[PDB]
Structure 1
Amino acid sequence: MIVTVINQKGGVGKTTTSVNLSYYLSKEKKTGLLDLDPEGGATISYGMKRELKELPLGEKSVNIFNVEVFPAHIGLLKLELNGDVEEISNKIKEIGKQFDFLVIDTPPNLGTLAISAMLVADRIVSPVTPQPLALEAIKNLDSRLKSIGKNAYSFTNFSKKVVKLDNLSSVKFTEITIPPSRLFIEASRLGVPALRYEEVRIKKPKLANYYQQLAKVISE
């Protein structure tokens, strides 16, 4: 199953979602994490660096913290500029064939890499926040989803209360809401997944429940 995480708006928690969902799924599934953002947030979140090499898409991967991570590289930039959407899509499908779950992190846009990941996604996930900018972004994503005949799941981040915009018929907003937590900040400063950091940092871990619910929602 290919799970593509999408949002025009930066800073909503796309990389956090990709990193921790892939880590959670890896506990029982052969899980891969494909970093399509040239800035490489997920790659850094697994303790690695962006490759200053124009790599072919999906050639290089490392098993870090139980996840097969494909690090970001400067080649993505060229793929963002000259990339042929059909080739990138077929390459992503071929990469996804070798995993039970392939979670894809995307740049903060609906550009070449993001739309290629969307077109072949088995599931599309878009985090949202109560901030007006994120609501506008999810409206635009609903329009694009209709443009490609697909649907997406959404969950709320940075909040105690769920977001549900019923007029976006292509977006299924779940009842999952992730509140602010400095665990995410500390774990991102380490460059480790927040779930794993919590598994040693606090007596009674809590963040795993949200990603369990997200995995259950998309697995249906």
Structure 2
Amino acid sequence: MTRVLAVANQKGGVAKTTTVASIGAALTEQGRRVLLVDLDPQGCLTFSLGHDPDKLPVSVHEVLLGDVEPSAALVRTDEGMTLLPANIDLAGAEAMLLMRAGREYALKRALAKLDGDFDVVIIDCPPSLGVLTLNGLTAAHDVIVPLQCETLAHRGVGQFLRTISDVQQITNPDLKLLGALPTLYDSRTTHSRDVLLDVADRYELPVLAPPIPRTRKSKGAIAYREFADALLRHWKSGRKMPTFTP
């Protein structure tokens, strides 16, 4: 049973890409066959895993258009994860997909061609609420929102939840919002805690545990492995994701 996890937040700089790669690595160490999908035309995930996006002969762009089979675009990573990479060509997807029926299902259609090949698919969405993020949410079974807790600035959470609700109404009724993964947690003061409590109070959004601290045997890596183990057990036995605050 392939599990597809979308990692989404229209706010940039909240450690989405780091989260995708780090959860991917932790799951791989636990024996899962992991595919990572880069849906950001800027190619941050792709670059971070050792591939120059500008030099890829093809990418997820051609895969979303149906011009290249998904298997043909996959590349390898040093840690064993498989990558469906991105480059700047993907910025053109919007103009080209808008002209076609079912633009929201392009990634879903692509992953269907790979089903059974991976235990876990993790999708790194760009910092936007356009067709690429919609493709990520439409293809996923679960979604988490990496959520910075350095500052109280969270005015985008409301529109993000509206987007989840719209997807559930129209393109993906089975999408489950697992919750927010706190990122950039600062242990120096109680401020990050207070930020998370304010978010938990104001928004219909579970705040998950543990927080990822601002940074193999590092505290950030330990927190990612702890969160990845929580994901595993949720998918294995239906255990509810532990929460930062009830």
1:168 aligns with 2:203: yes
Paired amino acid for 2:49: Y
Deviations 1:47-89 (A, max 9, x none): 1111455542233122212111122134422223322212333
Match 1:82 to one of 91, 96, 103: 96
Aligned to 2:12: 10
8 Å contact kept, 1:15–1:42: yes
Q: How does 1:12-51 map to 2 (within 5 A)?
A: 12-27=14-29, 28-51=31-54
Uncovered stretches (5+) of structure 1, i.e. residues with no partner? 182-198
8 Å contact kept, 2:214–2:220: no
Shift of 1:96: 5.2
For 1:94 and 1:137, locate their aligned partners in 2 and report how far apart those are by CA, in whole Å: 34
Aligned to 1:155: 181
For 2:115 and 2:223, locate their aligned partners in 1 and report how far apart those are by CA, in whole Å: 24
Change beyond 3 A, Cα 1:70–1:13: same
8 Å contact kept, 1:123–1:218: no
Give the structure with the higher percent strand.
1
Paired amino acid for 2:33: K
Aligned to 1:101: 120
Shift of 1:34: 0.9
Q: How does 1:47-126 map to 2 (within 5 A)?
A: 47-51=50-54, 53=57, 55=59, 56-57=62-63, 58=70, 59-64=72-77, 65-83=79-97, 84-95=103-114, 97-126=116-145
Paired amino acid for 2:39: L
When the two chains are superposed, the root-mean-square deviation of aligned CA atoms in Å is 2.1
Deviations 1:13-37 (A, max 9, x none): 0111011111111111111111110
Q: Once the two structures are aligned, what percentage of the paired residues are identical?
A: 23
Change beyond 3 A, Cα 1:128–1:105: same
Provide TM-score, normalisation by structure 2.
0.72
Mark the structure with the bigger radius of gyration. 2
- Name the stretch that deviates more: 56-65 or 29-38: 56-65
Shift of 1:143: 1.6
- Name the stretch that deviates more: 207-216 or 117-126: 207-216
> How many residues end up aligned between the 2 structures?
197
8 Å contact kept, 1:60–1:70: yes
Paired amino acid for 1:155: L
8 Å contact kept, 1:51–1:72: no
For 1:93 and 1:141, locate their aligned partners in 2 and report how far apart those are by CA, in whole Å: 26
Q: Which runs of structure 1 show a deviation greater than 6 angstroms over 4 or more consecutive aligned residues?
A: none
Match 2:227 to one of 206, 211, 214: 214
Paired amino acid for 1:177: P
Structure 2 residue matching 1:172: 3-state secondary structure? coil
- Name the stretch that deviates more: 143-152 or 34-43: 143-152
For 1:143 and 1:43, locate their aligned partners in 2 and report how far apart those are by CA, in whole Å: 29
8 Å contact kept, 2:209–2:227: no
Shift of 1:97: 4.1
